[PDB]
């Protein structure tokens with residue numbers, strides 16, 4: 048479980064940053080996003096337990112939790128590489144207070160910056176990160192339901208009990224509390240994402256084909272309460 052998870056973690060992804068307008072940063076981040084999602088897809092097909100449920104539900108869980116996954120991962124890199132001092136999007140794209148301003152996404156950057164700070168305080172470990180990331184993959188579901196709602200519950204309770212064994216009643220509360228707080232930020236990041244998209248017509252912010260399909264899928268119908276977040280507290 049832990050062994051497999053650490054082995055299947057994605058490889059380093061570069062932003063391909065070419066040196067600085069607001070349009071640039073966001074488009075670069077969106078392209079960065081499209082690139083990381085490719086790694087997520089590959090990651091998911093080899094994820095223990097997940098690769099079992101029907102592809103429908105598999106594509107579905109990936110389309111509802113993509114923001115949780117990428118932002119938590121950003122938080123991890125920022126913690127591992129800069130001790131949660133800056134926002135480490137990629138080796139060639141590390142954000143500072145200024146870059147945080149250029150992208151016109153300051154409070155939103157400060158928001159995730161705060162998550163990563165909690166990584167330091169809690170001294171989050173790599174194996175806790177890996178199991179916590181899978182739980183975020185299984186954190187959001189369509190209000191209506193998945194094809195195999197029973198196969199999902201089993202994998203989720205499995206990974207949950209997996210974090211318990213990993214922790215063994217101390218940081219488990221802290222870790223799950225953090226996962227719960229991730230949803231709060233993701234909501235903010237998502238709505239900002241939907242605005243930039245429904246206005247990119249003028250903002251000149253480009254969106255990779257991957258994002259376009261996910262957003263135009265999540266935003267359209269699942270804007271309302273069609274996405275039920277699973278909380279631990």
Ligand SMILES: CC(=O)S[C@@H]1CC2=CC(=O)CC[C@]2(C)[C@H]2CC[C@@]3(C)[C@@H](CC[C@@]34CCC(=O)O4)[C@H]12
Nearest residue numbers: 073076080117118121136155156159236240243
């Ligand atoms: C401070 C943050 O959390 S940025 C957030 C997470 C992330 C981390 C990465 O490492 C790789 C890149 C991503 C996936 C961003 C890509 C761009 C997103 C979808 C942003 C939130 C809002 C935005 C800005 C413009 C837009 O169209 O929507 C994403």
